[PDB]
Amino acid sequence: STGSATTTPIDSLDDAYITPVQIGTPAQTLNLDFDTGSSDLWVFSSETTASEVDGQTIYTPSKSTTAKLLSGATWSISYGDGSSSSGDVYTDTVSVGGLTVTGQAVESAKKVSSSFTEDSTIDGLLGLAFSTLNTVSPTQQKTFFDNAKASLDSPVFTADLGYHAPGTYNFGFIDTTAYTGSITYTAVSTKQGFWEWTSTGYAVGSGTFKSTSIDGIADTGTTLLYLPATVVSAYWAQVSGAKSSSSVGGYVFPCSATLPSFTFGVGSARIVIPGDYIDFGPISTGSSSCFGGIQSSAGIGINIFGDVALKAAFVVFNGATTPTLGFASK
């Protein structure tokens, strides 16, 4: 079997992407944030504290003939950005782009932090990291991808994120019309539960390529590209007036600037992030200071290839026994 669903930016800055997901019988369609950096599928629901819901579509398990409480199971998660959620667990039928999993753990939020409440366009998350990170207790649960794997034509999913435009998540197959040239595959470590790999280097604009190993995670659930301070400094030094602002929380640059591209290495291959992708607009409405899409990972503890990087590529998440990541230009 296979699945194919369109994923759509939630706003004009591509801050996140939502993908429609059918849960329950009859279907309840919720728009979820597919996150290769976590491993819980959780939703706003009829159980969510009423004051913490503001515009989201909710899952109501009592209206689903296939929903069953997973007795005793609870969950609680905190994300890299400091947001969090928690609640209890149902199993139900979950379908993505025509691909159906029965008995999927659907984690029902009783509590969500303010950033989730404030984002009316995201109805929950669908984790696509490794199931070892799943937070359900006392019995850890599998991701949608892990549950689907055996039914899939090929044990893969692909991320094809758009720049200021819709894109695609595919499950079980590689769309050879969706990229140009060849796909370069690179080794993954699952030791931390992430799609963790090692980039072979970088270039800034039309500068020469610097060969150097950069360990990081492929994370669709992170907006920006977070890299070592040396790398980020080399990039922003090429933008007149750019600086790191502690008051704002990262590199800012004059909105009048033209940004250079950024290239990262995948084995012997090169992915080019256009300069426009690195512009995240005024720090506040009407400001002439703009926020940079490449930021330092120092003090995060890990480098993050987030959407800024991933949307410049067609990305294959290969969940075979020996997992790998593939990158192609598009």
From Swiss-Prot:
The keyword DNA-binding does not apply. GO terms for molecular function: aspartic-type endopeptidase activity. The active site is at residues 35, 199. Disulfide bonds join 255-290. Keywords: Aspartyl protease, Disulfide bond, Hydrolase, Protease, Signal, Zymogen. Its EC number is 3.4.23.22. One of its GO terms (biological process) is proteolysis. Coiled coil: none annotated. Residues 17-328 form the Peptidase A1 domain. It is an enzyme of class 3 (hydrolase). It catalyses: Hydrolysis of proteins with specificity similar to that of pepsin A, prefers hydrophobic residues at P1 and P1', but does not cleave 14-Ala-|-Leu-15 in the B chain of insulin or Z-Glu-Tyr. Clots milk. It comes from the Eukaryota. Belongs to the peptidase A1 family. This is Endothiapepsin. The lineage of its organism: Eukaryota, Fungi, Dikarya, Ascomycota, Pezizomycotina. The chain holds residues 90 to 419 of 419 of the full protein.
